[PDB]
Amino acid sequence: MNTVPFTSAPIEVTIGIDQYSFNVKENQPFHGIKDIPIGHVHVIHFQHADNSSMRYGYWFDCRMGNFYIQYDPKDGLYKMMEERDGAKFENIVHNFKERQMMVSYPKIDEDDTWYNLTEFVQMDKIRKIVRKDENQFSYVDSSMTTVQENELSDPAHSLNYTVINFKSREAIRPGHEMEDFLDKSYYLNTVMLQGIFKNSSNYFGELQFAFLNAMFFGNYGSSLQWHAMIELICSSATVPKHMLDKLDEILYYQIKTLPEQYSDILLNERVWNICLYSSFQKNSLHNTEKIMENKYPELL
C-alpha cells in the first residue's frame, strides 16, 4: 500500500482519487492519501471551489516513484512532484500518518470497479499519449485537445491518441471502397490491431484511458476518441471472440460508473444506438446492452 502526501492544502478544492472524492477546506490540515492499492494506475484530480471550470489531475503508478502534491501559488494549482530522496520521503509519510492527517483510499473489499475500469491501462502507454518525459506521472485537464482535433494548436499540451478516421485512405483499401467502409474489419484488425496497437490489450488500454479522461475531466476529445474506438469494433464483422466478450465487460463497468447526470454529454446517441442495435455486434454486448436499457432508455 502506497502513499501520496500533500505538502499542504492552501485553497478550497474537491480532491478526487480514482472514483472517490473529498472536499477539503482552505488551509485545512490535509496531508495526503494513503493505502493506495499497488498494481494499478491511479489518477488524483482537482476542482477548485472557486473555478468549477478546469478539472485537472495526474495519472501515476506508485511503483514508478515516490510522488507528492504541492500547491503552487504562482501557477495556482496543485502540482504533482517526485521526491528522489527515498529516506526523506518515508520520513514525511510516517510523520503525517502518525498525526493522522491522511485520508484512506476507501476501497470496499468486494469492489473490483477500479480494476475493471483500468484493466488494460498501463502507465507506459499513458506517457506516450501525454508526452512529458521529464515526469513519471501525466497531467490531464478539461481543456486539453487531441492530435486529431488539432488537425481539423500547441503540440506540447496535446493528447496523442491514435487517430481513427473512417473516411481516410488508412481506413479504406483502394478497390475495396464499399466493402471496407461498411465492414471495418480490415481497418480494425490489420491496420489498427496488428499494425499500430500490436495487440488488443493496448487498444483496450487507450479506450479505457480515453473514457476515464472524458469522465473525470469532461475532456471532449477523449470522449470522441472513446466512441471512435468502440464504433470501430462494433462496425467490424470479424472480431476475435475474446475481444467482444472483454469489450462487453469494459463497457459495462464504464456505463455503470458514469455519473447519471452526465449521460447527456458523455454518451453519443448515434454511436450507441448503432453499436447496440444496428451493427454487426448488436448481439454481442449483452451486459452493456442490458445496463444501457435499464439506466439510460431515454438516450435510446
Binding site: 473516411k167 481516410s168 464499399m178 467502409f181
Partner: protein, 237 residues
C-alpha cells in the same frame, strides 16, 4: 456546405462543377411470379452527371449485368455511382476535373466521399434544391440509348443543345429544369407541348426541338401552366 436558393448563382461561375443524380441508376419492374410472390426485374439505368455551366452531360449507362449475383442492390447502386463518378474524374485532364461535385441525394455523400479520397481538394456537396433530374429518362434520346445498350457505355451529350449560343447558362439551366419539372409532373402533357407542332424538328445532334426565341417563350409559358395546374390537382387548391 449545402446548395440552396441563396447560393444558386454559384452554379454559373467559372469554378468547374458537376451535378450527380443517381435516381435512375437502379431501375426495376415489379411483377408477380408463377407462385404469386413478387419479384423485380432490373432494366438498364444511367448516372446523370451534368456540368450546369456548359451543358456537358456524362451519361454513364448502367447495364443490368452490373447487378448479377449481388445483394442489397439499392445500396450497391450508390457505391457503383460513386465508383463511376470517380473514374470519370480520373479520366479527365487535371484542368477539367471539377472543384465541386453536388449530389442530388444526400445518401450519395459518403459513397462519393470515400471514392474521392484520392481527390481531397474536390468538395462533395449536398443540395436543398428539389432538382428534377429523375425526369432525364423522359427525354426520348437519353431513354433510347440507355435501353438499347448491351454493355456499360459512356455517352456524351450537351443537354442545352445550342442554346448557349443565344442565352446565358443561368437561363439555360432554368429552362432545362422547367422542362424536366414539367416532364416529371405530367410527362404525357409535357411531351405533347414539345412535339405538337410537327414543323419544329429535333436536330440529329440535339435532344430538344429547334424552337425560335419567341417559340421558347410560348413553350415555357405552356410548361409553367402545366406545372401550376398539376399542383392545384395534387393538393385540391
Amino acid at each position: 456546405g449545402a446548395m440552396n436558393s441563396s447560393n444558386y448563382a454559384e452554379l454559373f461561375n467559372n469554378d468547374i462543377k458537376l451535378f450527380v443524380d443517381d435516381t435512375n441508376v437502379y431501375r426495376v419492374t415489379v411483377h408477380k411470379t408463377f407462385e404469386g410472390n413478387v419479384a423485380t426485374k432490373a432494366i438498364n439505368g444511367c448516372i446523370f452527371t451534368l456540368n450546369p455551366k456548359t451543358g456537358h452531360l456524362f451519361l454513364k449507362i448502367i447495364h443490368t449485368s452490373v447487378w448479377a449475383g449481388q445483394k442489397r442492390l439499392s445500396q450497391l447502386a450508390k457505391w457503383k455511382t460513386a465508383e463511376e463518378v470517380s473514374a470519370l474524374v480520373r479520366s479527365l485532364p487535371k484542368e477539367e476535373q471539377p472543384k465541386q461535385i453536388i449530389v442530388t441525394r444526400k445518401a450519395m455523400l459518403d459513397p462519393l466521399e470515400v471514392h474521392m479520397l484520392d481527390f481531397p481538394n474536390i468538395a462533395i456537396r449536398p443540395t436543398e434544391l428539389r432538382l428534377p433530374f429523375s425526369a432525364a429518362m423522359s427525354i426520348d434520346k437519353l431513354s433510347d440509348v440507355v435501353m438499347k445498350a448491351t454493355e456499360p457505355q459512356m455517352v456524351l451529350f450537351n443537354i442545352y443543345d445550342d442554346w448557349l449560343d443565344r442565352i446565358s447558362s443561368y437561363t439555360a439551366f432554368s429552362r432545362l429544369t422547367l422542362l424536366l419539372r414539367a416532364l416529371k409532373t405530367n410527362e404525357e402533357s409535357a411531351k405533347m407541348i414539345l412535339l405538337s407542332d410537327p414543323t419544329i424538328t429535333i436536330k440529329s445532334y440535339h435532344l430538344w426541338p429547334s424552337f425560335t426565341d419567341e417559340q421558347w417563350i410560348t413553350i415555357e409559358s405552356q410548361m409553367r401552366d402545366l406545372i401550376l395546374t398539376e399542383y392545384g390537382r395534387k393538393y385540391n387548391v
